[PDB]
Amino acid sequence: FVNQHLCGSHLVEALYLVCGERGFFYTPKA
């Protein structure tokens, strides 16, 4: 599900699902 264009909430959702209890950082401007 990650091998596609992922924008906005869709990208955040993918990071959430892939990263699990690690969490993640979402830095769109940089």
Place this chain on the structure above:
Amino acid sequence: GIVEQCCTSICSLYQLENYCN
């Protein structure tokens, strides 16, 4: 950054994982 790589172009697991803590 992540938007250029995953939004404007096709994402990958390798690239997403680089943003996990």
